[PDB]
Amino acid sequence: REFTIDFSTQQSYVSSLNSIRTEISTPLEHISQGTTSVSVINHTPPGSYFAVDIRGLDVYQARFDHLRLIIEQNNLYVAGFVNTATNTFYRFSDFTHISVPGVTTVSMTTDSSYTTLQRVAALERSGMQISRHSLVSSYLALMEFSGNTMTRDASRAVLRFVTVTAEALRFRQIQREFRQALSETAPVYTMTPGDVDLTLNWGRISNVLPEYRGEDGVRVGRISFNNISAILGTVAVILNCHQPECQITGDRPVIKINNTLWESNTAAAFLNRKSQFLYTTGK
Amino acid sequence: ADCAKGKIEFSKYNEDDTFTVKVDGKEYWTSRWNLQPLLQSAQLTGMTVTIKSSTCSGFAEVQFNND
């Protein structure tokens, strides 16, 4: 399947993301209002992908239109990018299992992890700025890219594009914050520490939210939700934890404590201390 | 003997550095400091505890079960 994400306006961008979500995921029964939900990615076989065509970087103009992202469907990971002008798929080293027919596949030495991309890019995600202008710059960098090893500018471009596509698909919070940059004012979106933490806790969130049954709150590590509107305003798509990212250790997704749904591992991680006097004196 | 079995209804740190829990309507205390986090954890996660003692006052044996 192929989808367009159209950056022309906030309307076209949100519409694009909503259409992708509808096709690839199913709403949770207990976290859904109207057609706005936390949705679980429908099971697909490993190696299944969808393509995302990037459009509308220049508002409503058929230009800057040769960038396609390849997204592994079960986990929304970006496996690489396609220059449709040269018909070339630049594939990250951790996605040799993703095969795209009809293109020249360039298998890269660089892996897709945020650790690697931030290093090569000399750009930290916390505080990263994204604008319409820097998305155009990112596009041009990716269209100029050639070879088997990511450059600094190609890595910066991938950091920006993954944030505004895959991470925004996962998190309605990132969708809402970034989309302001598409308005005629053309402000700058700055990725916050809270945005980053969401992206780092996606798997844990994904394991916990299917257990939600209207508790007054949800706690997953550093992440807290106090009501259903906070959940819906923050999260849009979660993994199908029926995937390696769902489980860290143990087998108990949640504990309900004082009408709050806790990730069990979080509670365990602050209930594993011995008597304080014995701890501090036993040096 | 199994003095009490059930959920911890409340726990209390005492001025003499002992620790009290109320289980199945009865209060018991322990002087063993490492039982303080163990009991509070059991209370927070909803464990069934079984207070055990020669007579069933103070205790220093307790079993913990997930609910």
Add this chain to the structure above:
Amino acid sequence: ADCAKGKIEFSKYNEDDTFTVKVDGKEYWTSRWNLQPLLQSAQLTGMTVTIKSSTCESGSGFAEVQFNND
């Protein structure tokens, strides 16, 4: 006496190794080190705590506290 009952509004580790909690608008400190992580667990989980002392003036000390769930 029951000096204060409610959820812990903040906790604070002090330079003399005592530990302060604010409950129902009043602050109390304890020198019992064992209470430090227990109070933090209570604070994290929204336990209702009851501060007990012979002196209940805000800023006073305590060494007895009850922990309740909802």
Add this chain to the structure above:
Amino acid sequence: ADCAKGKIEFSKYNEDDTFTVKVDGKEYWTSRWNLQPLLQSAQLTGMTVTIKSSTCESGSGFAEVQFNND
């Protein structure tokens, strides 16, 4: 030897301050103080542990345990 690998079925604090866990249907005790909260947290989260001891019969002691991510 690796005596038992699995989730902790119950744990027990003992009168002599040792600490007992039941794993794979067999009971084991340890006198290592630091293992008490570590085992209980493993218990509450369903963490698999491997009990290692010279003897594997129920009622054996251990001083070594691995916490697994299974």
Add this chain to the structure above:
Amino acid sequence: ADCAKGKIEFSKYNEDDTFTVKVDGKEYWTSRWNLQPLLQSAQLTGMTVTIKSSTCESGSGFAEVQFNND
């Protein structure tokens, strides 16, 4: 004085028995072992911490810190 307020970005125990935390872009250290589980719990649960010290220079020590859920 309030030196830094925010969530804990990282924590680190050093060979020289100091415990560093980074809060709001600034690093401070403490050698109070009491504070290690308190700070790490605060880090893993996303508490807002307020590092407090008589003077707030970069790389300096502390032994007062407030803990808030939000």
Add this chain to the structure above:
Amino acid sequence: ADCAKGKIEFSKYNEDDTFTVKVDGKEYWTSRWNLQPLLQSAQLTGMTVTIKSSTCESGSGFAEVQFNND
């Protein structure tokens, strides 16, 4: 040196009371008593830890570790 940076694949309480973690395919032990709950907490929450030591071969000891959120 930075020996290993990754999630804790398992932890083990050893017969000599040191504590071992496996990170990025290599095992490292520490005798630092303060680190035992902290390391288990990392393992439970899948925190990325950075093991720093003068030798990095599997089986090396360490006393310095950073706890990351990413």
